[PDB]
């Protein structure tokens, strides 16, 4: 168990790794392979990389709410086939890639279960890189929650809900 965390096994035999509110600037090393719930809420994390969850393929819940995350590698979740919930709410993300969620979505579908992504309260940049999520939300996706999903930029779209903006308003210049 990492020194900044508490690792406890539940009555159901599931290991919770609780590292909330510890001032962490990075994901801790040596989280045990048996980790099922990883709580990293209320820290100072800025980046999720391709290797942030290396060796943590049993994770069912990841709580990264209320950090300072401004980028997540599109490869970060590519081996997380048991993920039920990921919380990236209250961070500094301006975009997320569609490819980021492919594996947990596919795995959840194959396993007959729900995989939920909670992205509330990020400063979304509503250019052509976020049209995909805008449209999934507009369509009624069961994967991506639509609470507090609003554009920070560009100026014309500031304050508008992603799911209420037409596709042709999501524009990229050079």
Numbering used by the authors: 21 to 194
What does the original paper state about this entry?
VLRs are featured with a LRR domain of multiple LRR modules and an invariant stalk region rich in threonine and proline residues2. Jawless vertebrate AIS employs VLRs as antigen receptors to recognize invaded pathogens, such as viruses and bacteria. In summary, we identified Bf66946 from B. floridae as an analog of variable lymphocyte receptor VLRC using bioinformatics analysis and structural comparison combined with in vitro bacterial binding assays. This is the first characterized VLR-like protein in amphioxus, suggesting the emergence of VLR-based AIS in basal chordates.
We applied both the recombinant Bf66946 and Bf289081 to crystallization trials; however, only the crystal structure of Bf66946 was successfully determined at a resolution of 1.79 Å in the space group P212121. Each asymmetric unit contains two molecules with a total buried interface area of 567 Å2, which is not sufficient to maintain a stable dimer. In fact, gel-filtration chromatography also indicated that Bf66946 exists as a monomer in solution. The overall structure of Bf66946 (residues Cys21–Asp202) adopts a crescent-shaped solenoid conformation, rich of conserved leucine and isoleucine residues involved in formation of the hydrophobic core, which is typical for the LRR family. The structure contains a 36-residue LRRNT, an 18-residue LRR1, two 24-residue LRRVs (LRRV1 and LRRVe), a 20-residue CP and a 51-residue LRRCT. The inner concave surface of Bf66946 is formed by a β-sheet made up of six β-strands (β1, β2, β3, β5, β7 and β8), with β1 anti-parallel to the remaining β-strands that are arranged in a parallel fashion. Notably, the 20-residue CP in Bf66946 folds into an α-helix that shares no identity with the 13-residue CP of previously identified VLRs. Moreover, the N- and C-terminal caps of Bf66946 also have four strictly conserved disulfide bonds presumably important for the structural integrity: two within LRRNT (Cys21-Cys27, Cys25-Cys39) and the other two within LRRCT (Cys146-Cys171, Cys148-Cys192). Altogether, lamprey VLRA and VLRB possess an insertion in LRRCT, whereas Bf66946 and lamprey VLRC possess a protruding loop in LRRNT, suggesting that Bf66946 is more likely a putative VLRC rather than either VLRA or VLRB. Thus, we identified that the residues Asp105 and Asp107 at the concave are key to recognition of Gram-positive bacteria.
